[PDB]
Structure formats: C-alpha cells, structure tokens
C-alpha cells in the first residue's frame, strides 16, 4: 500500500469516478426530485455529471473500449444503456415503474421514501416485501436488521460470546440463530436503545453504524406503513423511531428524554410503579414527597410541565351517508420552550376504527411557538361504511417526543346519520327537440344560430318548462345547459304574461352580472324585455324592479326587497323566480339565500299568487329536502347526474406529501407543466392559482418549464402581430411580458380592462395557459379544455392557518372547463395534499348533498321577520323557520343539525331552544323586546338594522361605542370595529404593509393588531380619508370597505339620531 | 304533530325533567324485576 | 423458566393471526332453549392479545337485538387486569363499571384455554358461579363461559352455560384444585354460538395499568379496582405488560460517523 | 438575499468551517451555521440563516426530500470543499449534486458561483468541466510546492 499512498502525497493518483454503484439511486433520486422523466431527460442528467466527464476522458477506466468510444464520441448509448439498466432496477425493487417502450419512468411512493431517507433500492425492496400489517414488535427488528445497509456486516467469531451475553439481557427477543448477522444487528440495536455496555471496539462501532442506518431504516420504515394504512405496524415503526431518537426504551421514564433530569431522579421514578399522568395532576411538593425527593420535586414539575402533552377534542358531523366531516381541536396544555419543544412540535395524528390496524385518516400538524397555547382546529373526512363501529380512536403521537401520545375515543353510538340519498332524474333516451320545437318565434329567434337542437337534459326538461309553470328543481353539472333551461323558463313566463316580473337571484356578484349581460342581448336585443340588474341601493331597486322585469338580483340585494314584502307591492307581484346555482346554500351566501327562499315561499302562499319557482343547481344527493323546502314537484324534479354531463370530465388528483403550502406551491409548478403538456398539448388551460399574487408566479414558473425544454413558447398559437395591440393596452410589464409567450394572467388586483383583454385572447386561441386567481373561478366567462386546479386553498392570516377550499368553486374550477365544441372531453387535474386528495376525490363523481347552515345566521333572519311584523311570537317564528330549508335538513340529518333525534318532540325542542336563543341574542343586543317570554316586538335598534341591512351585534356595537361627546377619530374606529369589517382578507405578506401604513394614518391607532380585520379596515378607512397610496391588494380591501362603509354610516347617524345626539350625528 | 309547536325553556326544561323522571322510574323498575329475576334464578338452585 | 420460553411465547403470539382465518365452532350438544351473537372481531382482537399458555380472561357486557329476546349479542368485551396460570385464571373482584357499560347487560366471561378440551373446567365453573353468587348483576340463564381453547392450526371455541345447581355446587366448593369434591358433569351446560359479520363489538382497556398482569403478580391484586374505558387492549408479550423485562439494564471510543445519509 | 452553501465532508470540519465563517464575517453580520436536525428543522435553518455549512450527503436529501427547494433561489455561492473524495464514499453524492445544480442552471437558468476546491491530483480538467469551471481562469491546479 506504499503506492498509492506515494501517489497520493505527490499528486499521481487520479480521481475515479464511481458513480456507476449509486447510479439507481441516483436516477432515483432525479426521479423523485422531477429533474428526470423519460430515459432522454435521465441520459441528459447523466451527462452533465462527472460520471460521463470520466468515461469521455478515460474510457478504459470506465470499462468502455475503443469502439465504444468511436462509435459513441459524446457517450450517448453508454448513459443510454446505464439509465436503462438503472430504470430496471427500479423498476425490479418496486422504487419507479419504468416502461422500456417509451422509457418513461414515473416515481412511485417507495422510490420516492428511499430518495427523501437515502435508502438504495435494495433496502427499499427489502422494505416492500418484508413489511407486514400484521407483523409484530419481534419481527420489526427482523426487518430492519434484514435490509441493504447492513449487508457487509458479519458477525464475527471472537463477538459471540458478547452476542450470547447481550441475547439474555435484550428486551427484544430474536428468532434468528447467533450466527445471523440480522439477529447480531437487531441485539445491537437493542443494545444501544437500552444504553448495554459493550466490551469490543469494533462490534462498538458496528453497532454506531447499525444505529445509524436504522434511525433512516425506521424513518422510511413508517413513511411505508402510512402510506400502506396498517395503523398498528405505523405506532410501531414510530415507537421503534422514538427508541432510537431518545435511546431509551418504551418501557421507561418520560422525564429520561430531557437532558436537564438527573439520573438518580429518573431511576427512583422508574423504580416505582406511576404512571406519568399521575405525576402531571400532583403539584411541585406532591410529586416530590411521593417520589422520596422533595429537592427535586419542583424540576420534576417543571419537567412534567414542559412536556408535549395536548388536549384532543373530537367533533363529528355527518354531511353524507358515507363520509362525515371531524374537526379536531389540539389545545396545547404544556408550557411552551425553546429549550425542551423548541420553535415548533411536530405531531402526527392517525383517525382510525376499532380494529387500530387500519389508519382511516393519517396527516401532520406542526404547533408553531407563535401559534403556541391555542387550539387549532383541524377539518378532515372520515369515511364509514355499513359495518359502523361502536367508535374510532384518534391517536395524536409525537414526532420528537417519546412515550408522549394523546388517544381519543371518538364515540359514533349516538350519531344521527342521514338516509339513504335517492338515485337522480336520469336523462330520458329519447329524440332532440329541434329550434322549431318552441311555439314563439321570437324565442326561437333568440337560439336559432346558437344550436339547431337543444340539450337532451334541455329537451327533457322543456316538456315541464316551456309546457308547464310549476317548481322545478333542475340538479345539472355547470356545462349541461342550466342557462338554457332558464331562458325556456323565462320564454314561457313572457308568453304566459307580457307583463311578468321574473326575478333571477344569484349568489355570485359576477355571475349575475354576466347573467344581466346575457340577457340584454338575448331579452332585451331579441325579445325587447326589460332585463335590469339590482344595485345595492334600496332607493332605486323599487324602481327597477318595477319598471324591469327581468331583474338579476343576489340573495344578499334581494333581503332588503323581501323584508319589505309587505309593504313593496311590486315584489309581491311576481311571475317567476329563478334560483341560479343553489347548490351553494351550504357555504357563502348560504343562509341569506335560504332566508330569500323561505321569503319567497312565504309571499308565494300568502298573497294568492303562486310564483314559478326555478332552482337550477348542481346535482344534489338529497335533492328531495331541497325539492320540499322549495316546494319543487316529483315530476318537475329534473336533478341529473353528476356524469350526465354533455362535456365528459377526466378528473385527475394529484397528491403531495408537503405540509408547508409555500413549499406544496413551489414543488407543483413543474408536475402541473407536464401535465399541461402530456394531457392538453394543442387546447387552452386555465390554472387556478391559491392566491391572486401567486397567480404571475405560477405563470412565471410555466414559462421557465416551457422555455427549459424544446417547446419554447409552445404556449402562443398566434403570432406578435396580432398580439401587440393586445399588449399595448396593458399596465403590468411582466403580464405582457408573459402574455408574450402565450401565458395570460389574471388576478383580482389586475385590471378589468386587461383582464377583459386577456380573456378575449384566450377564447381566440392566442394564449394556451390562463393563470387565473381562486377568486376568479366562478367569475370567468371562458371555457378551456383542461383545468389545473394546483394548491387549492387558502393561507389565511386571520387564523394563520391553511384553509382548504370550498366545494362550491372546487366545481365551478372543474365546471368552468367545459367545452361543448372546442374540446371533445375536459380534463381537471386538482394538485393538492394527500390528506385532501380523497376529500376531492369523493366530491367529484358523487353528488354533493345541501346542509342548511342557518343556525349560525339565524338572528338577522329574526330581526327581519320581527322587523317587518311577521314573527311575533315564538308560534309565528316557529312556522316561519319550518318553512325553510333547516327544517328540511334537520329531519334529514339531526347530528349535521345539532340535534339528538328526528323525532317530533325533539325537533320541536331544537326549534324551540333556537327561538329563544334568538330572543335572547336580540334583546341582549337591545334590538327587539319579549313581552311576557312569548311575544316579540321590534326596537328601535333593530328596525335600524333591518332598514340599513345591518346585523344586531354591529347595531349593538354602535349603540354602545358612540356617546353624546364622540368625534369622527371615534366613529371611525366604531365604524371600523363592526361586524361589517370582519370579512377583510388577511393573507401572507401583509403584516409589514399594515405596520407601515399605520405610522402615516391621521388618527393613530391605541395597540393596533396586524391580523385582526378591524385593524386593517381603520387602516383602509384612514388611507381612504387622506388618499394615501396603497397596493392593489389593499385598494380591493378598501374598495369592499367603503362598499358598506356608507350603510354603516348611515346606520351610526340613524343610532345617533335615535339617542338624541346632534354634534355626534354631526360629526357622523 | 306536524305543526312544530313552540314552547318556553321552563316549559321545555319542565318537559326533560318530566323525561328525566320517567326514566328514573322506568330503570327503578327494571332493576327491581332483574332483581326479582336473580332471586327467582338463585331460589331455584337452592 | 422465563429465560428462553418467553422468546418462544412472544414467538408464537405473533403468528397469532394465522389461527383466526381458520376459526372452528362446536356445533354439538346444543340445548336450543338465548344464543352468542358475538362478532369475530372481537374474537379476533382477542385472540391476537393472549398468550398460548396465560389463560387471558374478559368479560362480556351486550344487549339484545330488537324484536329477537331469545339471542344475545355481545357488544363490549371488558378486560379486567388478571395473572393466572395455565389451569386457572386470577381475576379481580372489582366489576368494571363505564358509561358504555352501563347500557348493556353483563353476558359472563370468556377466558382462553392452553388446551382443546371437551369438558368443562371445575376452576372456571367455580370462579363464574363465585362470580354470579358475588355481583347480583350476573344471572344463572343470561352469563356464559365462553372457553376459546387453543387447536393445532385453528381456533376452538366452545361455549358453557351456569347451571343453578351448578352454580350452587360451585359457590359452596372452594378448592382451587384440579379436581374438587363436587363436581359434576351436569353443573356445566353448551349453550348456542355464532358469529357475526354486520356489527363490530368494542374493546374496553384499564386506563391507570394494563390489561397483561401475568409478568409481575405482585402488582396485580384480587381487590384491586380499576377504571375501564374504550380502548384498544395492547398484547400479552408487550413492552408495557413486562416492566421488569425492559428496565433491567444498567446505565464511547467506537467509530463516530457523524453526519451520514440520514 | 444570498446564501453561501459550504460542503464539507466531515462533521468536525464542516463545524470548524461554520465557526470560521461566524469568526470572520461577524462584522458583516452573516449567520454561519450547520444544517442539522429533521427536515423541518433543516428548513427553519436555512430560512433563517445565510451560510449554511453542511455535508454534501446531507444536502442531497434535502435536496431530494425538498427542504431546500423554498431557498433554491436565494442560494447563490456554492463553496464545494475537499473535492478530494470524489472517488471515497462521497463520490456519487457530489456528482449527483453537481449534476442536479448543473441541470438546474441549465433549466431554470440560475447562475450559482460554484467553488470547488480539491487537493493536488491529476486530471483536474474533466473535474473541472464537471463543476463547470473555466480552465483558464476558474481553474488553478497548485503543485506540493505551493
């Protein structure tokens, strides 16, 4: 050996490359990390490496000869047959399903746990066929001592008497014989984990490197079990991982993980039979006369003190028949440290049965220090089946901590499950009705061009639209013609009666602007009908709704016209009333558009003039609730299916193990370019961003996937020519910029001249990638071909947490790609987490059912039946709540309801107990009066709120904030801190802006609060006032302020006026 | 009955109460027959 | 010995599932005059936590279902802290007593069996009339003793009902012997059994210790009380049924391979 | 705004490397430290400080598990010390590093200064190519006598 070390230390010994044994890995690796897909991309990754450098340079050390290297000067077929051999022994040790047709090689979850712990491909196959669900503690050890990085370790002959002396004293049995190495390196790890005393230095270090393989070895091994769901063999893998993190055993003290313990202490607590439970309930001098130590009683206390130990409580809702949503509250009850939690606690949370054996539900929470001492409520989807348990248990485990894991029962004894959901109106097989299947020409006219036949829901559904006038609850996908359904509903309300009044309420502000925009050129351009669009002024919506009479209106305008449904003789004098995507009640503006429909229920059957009711939505499972409630017929109920949808939709999910979302959003950018690439070539997409300012990023990032590869500005289908008077109109340098290479953005901060541009170019077929904004999903008046939904959900800084989206714009996102002639199928591929991606995944093919939600918002709807006279009792607010949708959803789900039977007796105390705790949040805000606990009267204060569209706990703030000597610094801040401004968006990134913007505000601001909305609305209140510049984030903020701002100053003069105030109503 | 009839809270704390005492009674009387049950059981063995 | 055995205990127990997919029932000497509705997940989970030689002991707390008074359905299965040999079983005489409890009716005690045997145990017949004769809440036609014995490859199991005479043969007799003066072939009855498929049956665990007391019988007291509660029960040969097993051990210039793949 | 990744190959040295760096460039107040711990931890590191002096192994699994994919962009000097051992054990490691940072200036086109520094050995030129070095004025061999 003097050669090489001669060579060594007078520069003689070149460096061999000898990649060529970690060259699996490391295609796996690429693999996982999405730098290679095809053998092309893992041909090019190799070559850049110095692996291919040493075999150009010198072939012979490469075992390449000369005529591998005349034949091959750029070494081409040798990195081609290296990736070929290394995508066999992927796909021979099940880490990568590598195709040798194509060459593709997709990573899968074991190639991807072997990439992420640094395990070999061997080690990983060993993992995947040695892991059990049913394997014990005995045979865990087994297989992880059986894997690829201990196969060089042998046992040696001069160790075995130390192997048999350390066999008698392991607490963890080995089947296997002495001379095994697996059973030497399985009685190591016990060993170590147990701190024995070894006597060799080299079976020392042996059992340091078997350590240190296992601690990966048992990482990877319960990244493996959570992925398979075997729930007993995952609590195993994490108690063997917590064994060998804290080097102790299972079986000992929780005081011998922290540093700061003596070792005489912990072996006197581990001497006596107590639990650690017991010791958390005893004080700092109890602990220490029970443990004999009163000197040390006080750290043992502060010890049981800063250990993790958190509060789990567990609350269950059935929402179907199948699936039910569980919130989890984790209140931590531990004193928070640096020193012994550190600046976050990982915990990991397994929802599973009965059984433990198979994990229903497996996700992550990280408790940050700054979110520390505050329970966080986490919302997953709990499956259930016929078999139903007696109850499910809740494992909360910690990730660092050992012997540290909260168990919940979750019992499901007494839970009110709903029915079962009836099977949907299916499509009838029958002949197309032609355009001259209508009577009137001037209907016909207005649909002739557009197609010369109708849906064939649409034919289906006009024998009981166009033929007849009753309630009809049309459940169709968003794409199935619901629009065209609405126009033949509107055609026979005019040939019924020329002068109807059909009144089209909406939920979404932009949806029943392009509704009023259609039918100003279809009603009034082709039929000449008095199409208007309700306004937020109460003023001037009497006159529209009497001189209009197609009048597109929202539940949140409409509430004003139908508490004054009594008085306003022009909204009682309806002909028909469409309901547009009422599928939504469950959500925003979902009580509101219950109360407007329980409203119109009333005046339908109360002024001898029975409305057309339309409710057009999406399909229901329990659409015979929503068919009673809104008084539709069994005949008139045309609720289709969810795959009865003209456009076929290929919905795609696409799960990330990724607990930041930051990190989810950044990892997703070149997945949902591949997927753009592979699924819709030649077709515009629209990629639904989570947040408006992401949106130019996600953009940005589908151009450098686009300009890295050869398809560099694939995305422009037309040529500059055509597009530089396109970007010449734009503001933002980067959207034209983008836009250039055929990547529109469009977000709420955006323009709506420019984002009007960049829809007319993406329907033209300039652009083929349209990175649009999560709030823009329901407002987009543009059908592509695929949908890539990437990250859908929302950091809110109100909470500061990571809320997922709803399934109301989940389906208008996989709705919106819905072309009829463009496309022939529409492909929606939602990226999101793994623990979402079954959620998502269950609300697409099946139809989400309607839970009535008004409970929460129950006292506005009482203040306006008191308001108006209508509830004037507890009798009369009784029948005006089983009128609406909540008495039908409570007698279809009493656990979704919050009561404890469907029976009558208690359905009637549920009704009753909620009647008096409106009557009780109404008289304790000072806004109605109850005489004799039986009958209601309306104050002052709550007709004002009624009047001005107010809530009672805004009025009551204003009643009591404003005195006799405020001035306009108090106002505002009164006007600023009502329930109005709640509903300020509060994203990442908008502390700073909120801090800087208070240090140039002309009224200062006493302890201001970065995540609060009041906060933030004062702000945008004083930005307003002294025209102060702001971002465009806060100019949509402040816009949504001052909308209301005017109501709510109108409200504080009335409340000034009413208590006899002139130099406050003055100020105001 | 079908139309939902409001009641008070003390009416309807009244009722539970009444509900409550019911029950009492009915699970006094079932202890008392699963006791004369058992005394019958053990008076045939001995 | 507790030295070699305990290897080959914890060795048998965990190929403890291979024996529950082939489950076999004695369907002969049946009175047909209530039956067993109890599931086979419960027997399952039951089956997996007991040891080939620890006689495991629990007791059954059901109800019955609607319109069918003539058939018992063992919902809950309570395991109370015990330490008994291979002929006996040691259980404490603290009734568990919970919320999910409270709400069925006690159906006696199953306790597992070392060995397939065709007669009833003296022992076991006089600790369930003990048990009858002490808690008034356990009747003489509505408790049972299931005794699940061990089989070659399989699962024996093989229920027994409480004669009133037998009852009074056993609460009178106090040898704990393998043979007392007393007994009779007629104290013991079989009783119908099946299983079942359409409801799961719940798992009742000491929450203060375990339910494997077999390892320290010094811990383990027959007036000890417990509180139960739903949960699931860990295994006979645990690290937490064995205290003295793992904390046992007493309390550096090796290779120091520090920052690796990991 | 920047960050100076240092690969070394052992823990002690990779520690005396960071206390170095933290020695020397206190008055410009950049954060030396190692990145150690879980992948969380790991990632809290890196956000929260600038140099970042870790093992090539250990920096191709955050690479690989993505810990290091949030702060890619910020990461502009990569300081490759003891190039030696790229025949040893962390042979294969480095040059799927180099060839991930290879593949991601040639794709997302991010201009990285890569540093790499080895001892006295032959055929200096394919490592040099390898790491992307210029051979005139990026790459300085030195003899023994230097």
């Known amino acids: 050996e003097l050669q090489y070390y001669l060579s060594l230390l007078n520069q003689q010994l070149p460096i061999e490359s000898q990649m060529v044994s970690k060259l699996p890995d490391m295609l796996n690796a690429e693999i996982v990390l999405g730098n290679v897909q095809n053998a092309k991309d893992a041909v090019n990754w190799l070559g850049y490496a110095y692996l291919y450098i040493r075999m150009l340079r010198s072939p012979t050390l490469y075992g390449i000869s000369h005529d591998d290297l005349k034949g091959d000067p750029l070494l081409d077929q040798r990195r081609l047959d290296l990736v070929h051999t290394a995508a066999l022994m992927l796909d021979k040790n099940n880490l990568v399903k590598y195709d040798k047709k194509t060459g593709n090689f997709q990573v899968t979850e074991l190639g991807r746990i072997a990439s992420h712990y640094y395990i070999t491909n061997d080690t990983v196959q060993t993992y995947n066929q040695l892991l ?124 011998r993980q922290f540093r700061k313990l003596p070792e005489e202490v912990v072996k006197k607590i581990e001497k006596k039979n107590f639990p650690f439970e017991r010791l958390y309930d005893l004080n700092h001098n109890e602990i220490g006369e029970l443990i004999r130590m009163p000197k040390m009683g006080k750290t043992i206390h502060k010890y049981v003190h800063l250990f993790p130990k958190l509060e789990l409580s567990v609350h269950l809702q059935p929402i179907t028949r199948s699936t039910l949503k569980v919130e989890l509250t984790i209140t931590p009850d531990f004193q928070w440290d640096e020193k012994v939690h550190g600046s976050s606690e990982a915990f990991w949370i397994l929802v599973e049965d009965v059984d433990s054996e198979v994990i229903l539900h497996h996700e992550y929470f990280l408790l940050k220090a700054k979110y520390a001492q505050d329970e966080h409520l986490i919302t997953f989807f709990v499956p259930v089946f016929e078999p139903l348990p007696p109850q499910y248990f809740i494992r909360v485990v910690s990730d660092r901590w050992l012997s540290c894991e909260t168990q919940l029962p979750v019992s499901f004894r007494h839970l009110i499950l709903p029915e079962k959901y009836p099977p ?24 002739q061009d557009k197609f010369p036949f109708f849906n064939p829901i649409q034919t289906q559904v006009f024998n009981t639209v166009y033929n007849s006038d009753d309630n009809v609850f049309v459940g169709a996908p968003t794409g199935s013609g619901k629009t065209i359904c609405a126009e033949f509903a509107i055609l026979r309300m005019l040939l ?59 539940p949140e305008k409409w509430d004003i016209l139908s508490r004054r449904w009594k008085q306003r003789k022009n909204v009682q004098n309806i002909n028909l009333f469409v309901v547009d995507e009422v599928h939504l009640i469950g959500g925003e503006n979902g009580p509101v558009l219950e109360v407007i429909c329980s409203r119109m229920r009333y005046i339908s059957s109360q002024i001898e003039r029975p409305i057309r009711i339309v409710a057009l939505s999406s399909s ?97 289908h037309c040529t500059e020519k055509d597009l530089i008077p396109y970007l010449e109109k734009l503001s933002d340098s980067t959207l034209k910029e983008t836009l250039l290479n055929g990547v529109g953005y469009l977000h709420e901060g955006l323009s709506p001249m420019e984002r009007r541009l960049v829809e007319q170019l993406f329907s033209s077929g300039a652009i083929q990638v349209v990175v649009a904004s999560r709030s823009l999903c329901w407002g987009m008046n543009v059908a592509a071909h695929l949908v890539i939904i990437m990250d859908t959900q929302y950091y809110n800084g109100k909470i500061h947490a990571y809320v997922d989206y709803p399934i109301y714009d989940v389906l208008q996102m996989v709705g919106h790609a819905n072309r009829p002639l463009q496309d022939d199928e529409g492909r929606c591929v939602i990226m999101c987490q793994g623990s979402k991606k079954d959620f998502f995944k269950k609300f697409l093919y099946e139809p989400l059912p309607v839970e009535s939600h008004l409970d929460h918002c129950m006292h506005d709807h009482f203040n306006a039946e008191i308001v108006t006279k209508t509830i004037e009792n507890k009798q009369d607010a009784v029948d005006y709540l089983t009128w609406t949708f909540l008495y039908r959803r409570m007698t279809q789900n009493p656990n979704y309801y919050n009561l404890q039977g469907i029976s009558h007796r208690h359905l009637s105390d549920h009704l009753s107990e909620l009647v008096e705790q409106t009557l009780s949040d109404l008289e304790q805000s000072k806004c109605i009066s109850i005489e004799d606990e039986m009958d209601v009267a309306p104050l002052n204060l709550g007709m004002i709120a009624a009047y001005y569209y107010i809530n009672y706990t805004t009025i009551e703030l204003f009643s009591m904030s ?107 | 009955e079908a139309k939902p009839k409001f009641l008070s809270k003390a009416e309807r704390e009244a009722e539970a109460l009444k509900r409550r005492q019911q029950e009492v009674e009915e699970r006094q009387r079932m202890l008392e027959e699963e006791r004369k049950k058992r005394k019958q059981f053990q008076d045939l063995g001995r | 010995s507790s030295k070699t055995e305990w290897r080959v205990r914890a060795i048998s127990a965990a190929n403890l599932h291979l024996r529950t997919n082939h489950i076999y029932v004695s369907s002969d000497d049946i009175k047909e005059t209530y039956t067993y509705i109890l599931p086979k997940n419960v027997l399952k989970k039951f089956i997996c936590i007991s040891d080939l030689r620890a006689q495991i002991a629990g007791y059954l707390y059901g109800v019955s279902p609607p319109d069918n008074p003539q058939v018992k359905e063992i919902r809950c299965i309570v395991m109370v802290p015990q330490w008994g040999t291979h002929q006996t079983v040691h259980l404490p005489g603290q009734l568990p007593q919970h919320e999910y409890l409270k709400e069925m009716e006690p159906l006696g005690w199953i306790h597992t069996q070392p060995n397939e045997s065709p007669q009833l145990s003296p022992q076991d017949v006089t600790t369930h009339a003990k048990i009858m004769a002490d808690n008034p809440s356990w009747d003489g036609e509505k408790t049972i003793i299931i005794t699940c014995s061990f089989t070659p490859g399989s699962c024996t199991l093989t229920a027994y009902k409480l004669t009133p005479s037998g009852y009074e043969w056993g609460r009178q007799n106090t040898d704990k012997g393998n043979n007392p003066k007393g007994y009779l072939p007629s104290h013991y009855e079989r009783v119908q059994m099946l299983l079942s498929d359409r409801f799961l049956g719940f798992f009742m665990v000491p929450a203060q210790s375990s339910w494997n007391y077999n390892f320290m019988g010094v811990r383990h007291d027959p007036n000890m009380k417990y509180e139960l509660q739903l949960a699931n029960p860990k295994e006979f040969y645990h690290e937490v049924h064995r205290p003295s097993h793992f904390l046992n051990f007493a309390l550096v210039y090796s290779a120091d391979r520090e920052d690796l793949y990991a | 705004d920047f960050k100076i990744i240092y690969i070394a190959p052992m823990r002690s040295l990779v520690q005396e490397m960071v206390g170095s760096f933290g020695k020397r460039l206190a008055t410009y107040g950049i954060t030396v430290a190692e990145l150690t711990g879980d992948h969380q931890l790991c990632k809290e590191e890196i956000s929260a400080t600038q140099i970042i002096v870790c093992t090539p192994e250990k920096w191709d699994i955050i690479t690989r598990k993505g810990g290091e ?78």
């Open chain 1, 132 to 255: 059990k669900p049913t394997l014990s503690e005995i045979e865990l050890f087994r297989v992880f001592s059986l894997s690829s990085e201990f196969k060089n370790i042998t046992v040696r002959e001069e160790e075995k008497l130390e192997l048999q002396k350390l066999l008698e004293r392991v607490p963890i049995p080995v089947k296997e014989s002495i001379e095994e190495p697996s059973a030497k390196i399985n009685v190591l790890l016990q060993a170590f984990i147990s701190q024995l005393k070894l006597e060799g230095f080299a079976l020392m270090a042996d059992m340091v490197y078997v350590t240190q393989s296992a601690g990966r070895l048992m990482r990877a091994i319960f990244e493996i079990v959570l992925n398979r769901g075997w729930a007993q063999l995952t609590d195993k893998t994490l108690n063997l991982c917590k064994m060998i993190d804290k080097r102790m055993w299972q079986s000992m003290c929780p005081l």
């Open chain 1, 424 to 447: 949907p109106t299916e499509l009838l097989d029958l002949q197309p009705l032609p355009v001259s299947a209508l009577r009137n020409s001037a209907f016909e006219s207005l649909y």
């Open chain 1, 496 to 554: 019924q009666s020329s002068e109807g009044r059909c009144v089209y309420i909406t939920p979404m502000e932009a949806l029943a602007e392009q509704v009023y925009m259609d039918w100003y050129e279809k009603f009034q351009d082709r039929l000449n009908k008095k199409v208007v669009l309700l306004t937020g002024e109460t003023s001037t919506d009497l006159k529209l709704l009497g001189k209009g009479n197609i009048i597109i209106s929202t």
């Open chain 1, 620 to 716: 229901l499972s329990n659409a015979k609730d929503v068919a009673h409630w809104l008084g539709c017929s069994a005949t008139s109920t045309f609720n289709f299916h969810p795959n009865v949808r003209p456009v076929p939709l290929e919905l795609h999910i696409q799960g990330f193990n990724i607990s930041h979302t930051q990190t989810r959003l950044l990892s997703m950018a070149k997945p949902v370019y591949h997927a753009i690439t592979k699924h819709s070539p030649k077709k515009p997409v629209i990629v639904f961003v989570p947040s408006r300012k992401q949106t130019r990023l996600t953009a940005i990032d589908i151009l450098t996937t686009c300009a890295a590869d050869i398809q560099r500005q694939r995305f422009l």
């Open chain 1, 962 to 1068: 404003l005195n006799a000597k405020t001035k306009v610094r108090g106002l505002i801040e009164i006007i600023s801190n009502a329930a109005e401004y709640e509903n300020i968006p509060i994203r990442h990134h908008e502390d700073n802006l909120l801090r800087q913007l208070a240090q140039k505000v002309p009224h200062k601001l006493n302890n201001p609060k970065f995540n609060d909305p009041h906060v933030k609305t004062n702000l945008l209140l004083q930005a307003h006032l002294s025209r102060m510049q702001l971002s465009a984030e806060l100019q949509s903020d402040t816009e949504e302020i001052l909308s209301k701002a005017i109501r709510l100053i109108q409200a504080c003069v009335d409340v000034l006026s009413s208590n006899g105030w002139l130099s406050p109503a003055l100020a105001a």
């Open chain 4, 69 to 146: 994919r949030t702060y890619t962009q910020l990461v502009r000097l990569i300081i490759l010390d003891e190039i030696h051992l790229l025949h040893d054990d962390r042979g294969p490691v480095l040059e799927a590093l180099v060839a991930r940072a290879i593949r991601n200036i040639e794709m997302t086109q991010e201009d990285v200064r890569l540093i790499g520094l080895s001892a006295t050995l032959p055929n200096y030129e394919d490592v040099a190519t390898f790491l992307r070095v210029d051979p005139a004025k990026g790459l300085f061999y030195f003899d023994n006598s230097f």
